[PDB]
Design a binder for these strands. Structure first.
Ligand SMILES: [Zn+2]
Length: 655
RNA sequence: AACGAUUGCCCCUCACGAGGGGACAGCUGGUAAUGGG
């Protein structure tokens, strides 16, 4: 009833080509089509319909006049056409979503503002990239995708004098139907001194020893006592490397290209969906027959055939009252693990494992284990945080170094003199003497300035207002918030375009971005695997609080300095986003159930007593003021309550 | 539970002979504007 609709990708390399990809008929022809179509306007595309059949393809190439350089493949081409229309329509769909995101942000600030009391921005100018005629600025550039199709799908590299390999693959024989041998020897302590892959005596029998040269203390974990660890093989030379490869070809009109399949073997021995002995032809049939060659990267992305592998992917994360039905259904037969995860800044995630079982009309939430992530991964988190923060500051400083002349000075000192400029203009505008009123002692709840305003008694019109749900004069904090020297937003765009471009191209940023995603998958993977090895129940369904609307899950109190009203990017909300994103992707990659329950109330109540006074929480100690108790507010009470609001779809009642 | 998996990529360690750990949904968009019931 739940058919698979997801196929994981597998990436391999490419060894040698016939001739540089630009010369390729398929590619050069596709490049011409890309150029003709990405500078085509909108309205003709509406009329345009490239037909699936080949006679319609030829009718199409004739009615517009663009040529195909001898390549009319029935249903070979269709892929190129469909993806080209896909990218073209995306470059407006992706802008339309961008504008809608800005609109939602604008609405959110308006709700905050026209309630808090300050001026409400009528609107922000609509951003579109489509020109009136239909030409598309910022057009999608030429792409390296080279789709391959069933009638061309890769096949085991037999020897053909026309097919010529680089000199390193001098003698290559490989029985395509034979079982591919295992690379490393079974016992890795046998390799002798000379042969490659020789593990020196001091990496066995894990110990701690001092190197000869300077005696620096160096430990070693030893040979890994694990059963499912990829083995790394080492050859003496690059020609010895060559003869032990997995070469497959793709043949189209006497212009081939040979690609190396070791990646798919590794990707198949990972999931244990490949027996320990398996043949090359069986491996190639284990995957879908439509790779995508990336010509600007020399990387081939295979995908899995649905039947071999590929789980179900639930389209939507489940929130709210649906949880009731999910537990009623998933628990009707068997017991389900329920790990509750709670994100923060001191302790990146805190998880509490329970074991949901079932007696008619009840969900007993037996809890097993509160835990925190281990020490080594925290050390990795710290090194990543230091690294990426340093990169961001250097990146921003750089972007600043290059700008129009009229821009640098203001953005150099906009936030520098801001506190001095702000207080001086405020005093000058309302005449207040700074020294008679203490200035440094401004806190999150201080209201000294506003009472000083009423002492001056200039008027009552400007101050009282009626926050849309009692007419209350609000915090002077709001005035402080208003009087902040934000620069022109006509140039904010120019500033952010410089920032966008520099990061878009610089390698460092991509490296760090990939590391963040990889290191964040890991932080949620360890957690999920531990809950599985702890509950002994196959179905583990992590429940995670939404952050999109999180509005009270914050630190105890901001610094009472004047400097700290404007603490841009205060070391927050990069990781958290990543954790939530990694989970929301855990939803689809492995078909897991995920539960989103609104945080805001959750972290400040408890099961022992309903009472939920907002002052009960220091920020790291959850002291109840009825049932005197001491807990780590995050680790023990917050996760327990997330599970509690999970078992029932109703959020906890308030007073 | 399911019994060490041939390149690669990342991190960590190294007596450079390698060892340990990790991601595997990828293409490109995407952390950048004024959001403490
Ligand atoms: Zn209590």
């Amino acid at each position: 009833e739940e058919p698979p609709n997801f196929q994981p990708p597998a990436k391999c390399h490419v060894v040698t080509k016939s001739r540089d990809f630009a010369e390729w008929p398929i590619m050069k022809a596709s490049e011409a089509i890309q150029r003709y179509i990405y500078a085509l306007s909108t309205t003709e595309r509406a009329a345009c319909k490239p037909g699936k059949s080949s006679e319609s393809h030829a009718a199409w190439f004739a009615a517009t006049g663009v040529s195909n350089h001898g390549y009319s493949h029935v249903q070979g081409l269709n892929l190129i056409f469909d993806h080209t229309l896909g990218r073209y329509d995306g470059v407006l769909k992706k802008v339309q979503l961008r504008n809608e995101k800005a609109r939602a942000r604008l609405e959110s600030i308006n709700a905050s503002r026209a309630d808090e009391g300050l001026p409400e921005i009528k609107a922000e100018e609509e951003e579109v990239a489509t020109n009136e005629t239909g030409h598309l600025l910022q057009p999608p550039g030429i792409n390296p995708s080279f789709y391959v199709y069933q009638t061309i799908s890769p096949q085991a590299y037999r020897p053909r004098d026309e097919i010529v390999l680089p000199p390193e693959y001098a003698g290559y024989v490989r029985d395509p139907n034979a079982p591919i041998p295992l690379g490393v020897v079974r016992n890795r302590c046998d390799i002798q001194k000379g042969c490659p892959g020789y593990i020196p005596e001091w990496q066995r029998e894990a110990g701690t020893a001092i190197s000869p040269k300077t005696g620096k203390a160096v430990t070693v974990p030893g040979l890994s006592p694990k059963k499912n660890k990829r083995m790394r093989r080492y050859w003496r030379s690059e020609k010895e490397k060559a003869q032990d490869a997995l070469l497959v070809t793709v043949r189209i009109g006497t212009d081939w290209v040979v690609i190396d399949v070791r990646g798919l073997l590794r990707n198949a021995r990972w999931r244990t969906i490949a027996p320990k002995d398996i043949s090359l032809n069986a491996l190639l049939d284990l995957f879908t027959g439509d790779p995508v060659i990336d010509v600007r990267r020399n990387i081939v992305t295979f995908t899995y055939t649905l039947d071999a592998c590929g789980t179900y992917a639930r389209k939507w994360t489940l929130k709210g009252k649906q949880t009731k039905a999910t537990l009623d259904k998933l628990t009707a037969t068997q017991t389900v693990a329920l790990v509750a995860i709670d994100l923060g800044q001191t302790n990146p995630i805190s998880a509490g494992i329970s074991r949901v079982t079932q007696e008619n009309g009840a969900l007993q939430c037996e809890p097993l284990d509160r835990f925190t992530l281990p020490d080594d991964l925290l050390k990795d988190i710290s090194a990543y945080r230091i690294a990426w923060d340093r990169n961001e500051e250097e990146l921003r400083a750089r972007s600043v170094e290059a700008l129009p002349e009229a821009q640098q000075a203001e953005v150099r000192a906009l936030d520098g003199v801001s506190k001095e400029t702000a207080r001086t203009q405020l005093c000058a505008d309302f005449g207040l003497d700074p020294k008679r009123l203490p200035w440094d002692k401004m806190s999150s709840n201080t209201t000294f300035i506003s009472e000083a305003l009423l002492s001056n008694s200039v008027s009552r019109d400007q101050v009282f207002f009626t926050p849309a749900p009692v007419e209350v004069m609000r915090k002077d904090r709001t005035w402080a918030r208003a009087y902040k020297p934000r620069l022109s937003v006509e140039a904010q765009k120019l500033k952010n375009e410089a920032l966008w471009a520099l990061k878009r191209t610089s390698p460092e940023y991509l490296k760090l971005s990939r590391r963040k995603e990889e290191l964040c998958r890991r932080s949620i993977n360890y957690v999920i695997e531990k809950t599985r090895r702890r509950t002994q129940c196959q179905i583990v369904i992590p429940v995670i609080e939404d952050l999109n609307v999180r509005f009270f899950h914050g630190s105890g109190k901001r610094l009472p300095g004047w400097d700290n009203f404007f603490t841009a990017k205060k070391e927050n909300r990069w990781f958290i986003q990543g954790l939530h994103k990694a989970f929301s992707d855990l939803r689809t990659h492995r078909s897991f159930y995920v539960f989103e329950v609104r945080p805001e109330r959750t972290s400040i109540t408890c099961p022992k007593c309903g009472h939920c006074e907002v002052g009960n929480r220091d920020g790291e100690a959850f002291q109840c003021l009825s049932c005197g108790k001491t807990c780590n507010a995050d680790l023990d009470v917050a996760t327990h309550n997330l599970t509690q609001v999970a078992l029932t779809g109703k959020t906890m009642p308030k007073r």
